[PDB]
Design a binder for this molecule. Structure first.
Ligand SMILES: *C/C=C(C)/C=C/C=C(C)/C=C/C1=C(C)CCCC1(C)C
Length: 137
């Protein structure tokens, strides 16, 4: 299917609560929520190979992976991790992550393309789920 696109955020729920679990202190959580409104995701998908570029005003990061193949990235709060993406259905994928060093909350993310043309990202840390919704630019 067509995950490829230039996606811009329209809605972000529970992001602050996610950062709290991750041990980010309050003033930085607030500054981060503010930065999440100027926030875009660029995806290029060919088959089950994905290129994903996440950008805010002052920072940009690139993610490259093949579904079913372990790769290295970072958790939301910046800790390196080993990741593995699998399909859950036609238009939804799930990524499980394991810390490279040390211990912390169990994190993961999902991406889904809806019937109505939205991209839904969820990010989880333990019991807390952050949901973000994007539309094409
Ligand atoms: C597949 C799409 C993914 C894995 C998106 C990941 C997005 C992030 C790790 C976003 C992180 C952000 C912060 C850590 C604070 C500044 C605002 C965000 C939302 C860009």
């Amino acid at each position: 299917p067509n995950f490829s696109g230039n996606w811009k955020i329209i809605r972000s729920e529970n992001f602050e609560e996610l950062l709290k679990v991750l041990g980010v202190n309050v003033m930085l959580r607030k500054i981060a929520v503010a930065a999440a409104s100027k926030y875009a995701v660029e995806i290029k998908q060919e088959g089950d190979t994905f290129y994903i570029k996440v950008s805010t005003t002052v920072y940009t990061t690139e993610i490259n992976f093949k579904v079913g193949e372990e790769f290295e990235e970072q958790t939301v709060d910046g800790r390196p991790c080993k990741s593995l993406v699998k399909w859950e259905s036609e238009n939804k994928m799930v990524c499980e992550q394991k810390l490279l060093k040390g211990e912390g909350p169990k994190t993961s993310w999902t991406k889904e393309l809806t019937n109505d043309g939205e991209l839904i990202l969820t990010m989880t840390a333990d019991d807390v789920v952050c949901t973000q919704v994007f539309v094409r630019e």
